[PDB]
Design a protein around this ligand. Sequence first.
Ligand SMILES: [Cl-]
Ligand code: NI
Ligand code: NI
Lengths: 1075, 4
Amino acid sequence: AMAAAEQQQFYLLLGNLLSPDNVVRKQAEETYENIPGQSKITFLLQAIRNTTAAEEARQMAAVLLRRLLSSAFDEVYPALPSDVQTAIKSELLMIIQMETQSSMRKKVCDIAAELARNLIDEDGNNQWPEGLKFLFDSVSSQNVGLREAALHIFWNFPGIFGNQQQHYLDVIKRMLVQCMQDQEHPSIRTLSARATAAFILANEHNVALFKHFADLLPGFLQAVNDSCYQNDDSVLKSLVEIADTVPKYLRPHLEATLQLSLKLCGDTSLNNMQRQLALEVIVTLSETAAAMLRKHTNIVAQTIPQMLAMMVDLEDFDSNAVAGESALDRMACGLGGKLVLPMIKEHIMQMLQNPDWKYRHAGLMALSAIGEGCHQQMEGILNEIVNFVLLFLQDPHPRVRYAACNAVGQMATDFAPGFQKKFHEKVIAALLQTMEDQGNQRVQAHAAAALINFTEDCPKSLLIPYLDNLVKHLHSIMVLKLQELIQKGTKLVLEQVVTSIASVADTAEEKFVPYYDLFMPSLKHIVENAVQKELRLLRGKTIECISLIGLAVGKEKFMQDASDVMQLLLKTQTDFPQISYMISAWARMCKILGKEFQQYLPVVMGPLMKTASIKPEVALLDTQDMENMSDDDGWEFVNLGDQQSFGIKTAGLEEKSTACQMLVCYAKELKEGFVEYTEQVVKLMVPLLKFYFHDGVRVAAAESMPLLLECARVRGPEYLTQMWHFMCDALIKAIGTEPDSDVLSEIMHSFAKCIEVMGDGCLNNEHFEELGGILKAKLEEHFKNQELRQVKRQDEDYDEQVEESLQDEDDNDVYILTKVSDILHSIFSSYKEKVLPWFEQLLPLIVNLICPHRPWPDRQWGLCIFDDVIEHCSPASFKYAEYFLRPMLQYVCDNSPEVRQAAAYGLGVMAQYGGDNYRPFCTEALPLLVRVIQSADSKTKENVNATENCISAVGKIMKFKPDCVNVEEVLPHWLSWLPLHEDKEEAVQTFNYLCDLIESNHPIVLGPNNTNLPKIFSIIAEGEMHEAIKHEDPCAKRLANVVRQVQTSGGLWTECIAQLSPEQQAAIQELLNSA
Amino acid sequence: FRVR
Ligand SMILES: [Cl-]
Ligand code: NI
Ligand code: NI
């Protein structure tokens, strides 16, 4: 071996990774990246192990090994040899054991904790007992460095035990208690308090463990106070995590926890971030533990002056004023206006009358803040408030006028539509007067912003009566501001006015037609003059306005300018934030232009792919990283375990998603014209299934797939097969890996659609094998969750909020089950009997859904699955009847209408498709089905679909198995049960059989002397319930031929028609003219 | 969607 020579070369690489020049630093990062993860781990662990080597190289290797075990544990350790794996573990514990340097000691404790985390099996037990053993012995240890190391590992991964309660519980308690009482050490107390919070957060529903650890809470609070008056918000951030995820832990010392938060918040000597985070404890509690906070209204009453005081400190998102109004909003919403409005109401009234403008400004912002959560309680004072607020548009201080504009536009959102209905006269006049007649251009722009809110939430009917005077003023404003844009380049007010015109046009719809020529030429002269980079937001808002004007007037009015606008829209990229506006303008263009938009696809498809391909910026690092990048405002983080957080650049995520949705639109709406761009978008959308940063991106990626196969079908089946081969493996891997239930249901439904498109032969043996295991696991997970919800409903942590959560999980699980059935139906329809051997692996789990002690959605969907086996996989399906045949016959009289429907459907397709082996069962099924049909309230809203399927099944037995039933005796009864209209598919089935019966050479269905013909006409006349589709259904023609044959018997025709109502006779004519 |  060349191990020492390779390690020596690895040591030179670490040096180059820390070189000043980015030439060698990039050449080392490229080299490091190509080293297999299995070689990396040994190389890095050996570098850390050599303490006689450069300290900087050792620190580099520790950070690199910490990242390695986080980012890809599975790619590196599981594959390593067993002796190599045994050596990794013992070595890591030896490094921590012999380390002198505290900076290194901490980093190796992080590496040990990350490795320990990935060595816990599914059953819940430690696979590295030596790690847990080291932790246990280092707590006792005389070496302070080892006591600190055991604490560090535990803080990082407090789930280090599978016998946490079982025996070690008091060992943990005593350990945290000693390290928090020990005022002869500084870092140990802070670390111990954070470790406590971390252990509690890792035991989310353990009410008994909270009671057992409630003793440590007074001590944790002392550490919150202590660390804070030493500029350390670490333990105060732990407290905010407690209130958020696990507030029940605070209950034994809630008064103390609340008092501390109020004190830190009202303490002038603390920084803005510390005071905001302290307020955050009380605010979070109003959202997560309101019923608990509602017992201490005394503290909530004292929080109000604190938030108001913050709002008064004016002189931006991270300012006390902005933090204060946001907290007031969330708290009013969390606790409701019945409790909050009485507290804040009088404070606001006194602030509005105060001679200091900062109080008037804050009183108006506090009024805007409480509208979301106190508006039901504010309806009686609303008129008085609006009059008070309108007069602040004349306040001596301009900033107070801006806040009055803000309040007007906030009231137009919170109190809509009632606000618009009652106040349009005073409000529209004050807003227009402040826009036109006021000399301060900043108040004008704030007033236009409130007008957009008023019209955006004003219903069309409420807007139309005064549209003329509104449009009249907005035109005058636009015209005068356009003169200023030409000669001085001023755009502040014009930006808001253009959007106000767009909002008015979007509400008015066809009512904006007479006003099209009053704005449109002027709007085109705004985009041409906005070639400058400074006028980019204006040019974007104006493109939004032109497209929103065109969308309201329709394709006929917008047609004369549609080519001018499309050309001028593509001129923006050749003569140069604004991407979002252009992307949305083209969506409007297509929606108006219909299939004639196809000619513009070559010029818009370029930038549409470019924005659907934007890459996000990946962020990692430990504790102090999420607070240092709040200035951006477009950078969001998610607090993962180990305090090590993941961040993403929120900047292009919404544009990336919007563009993806446009390609979906184009593939289904411009089908014929999208074919040329199919192979490129298939390659774009396939890796987008694993884009775990944006839910809407994965949904769009999933929705695109069956739409892309319809385009690929016009080319031929060869292109279609190679397009399907790009997405088949990716779609299956996404079903087994998708974390979101809503996104998974979309992936499952698109996979199901693609199979129906492709037909038989679309899946290979590896894809069937992976699918079987994936669907088996989804079914196993369906049943574990039901068991878990049952035990969680008897837990000591059970409550109103837990109850709400469990019902949402149950609903999602039911929805996923509907999608398992969807994927199965398309496999059974395509493959028919060939796929029954493959289906056997799912058979135990599917038959489990139809166990009588399972919830009704389980029995329903288990029967839907067996209905597809009968319909598409017969006569082979009879080999499996020991699994479903007797349960379907017993389930036809079930208490659930949904279950009765699934069972009755199965009994009908058993008659039609099953074969001669089901004949004895067809005989038994008839009386059971008649019993459900004749049962009272069978045709009510809740039971009509189940009943219609019972009538349909009876008909399929009579039609396909006449030898198993007395058709001549059942026939007059079955004729009385018609017509069906709720279930259109089954209305067709019965209408086809009724036609067979009438057309028969022995038509006993007419009765003696054709006495049932009026009834037959009444049934058919219920072609007013849209059951018989004149077009695609050939039975519409057969029903018309039956009816028109009666015309040849004058008296019989006159009598059948005279017994119908005027709306029924006009339905018989409509049918006769169409078929 | 409707369903059976
Ligand atoms: Cl302001
Ligand atoms: Ni395949
Ligand atoms: Ni009857």
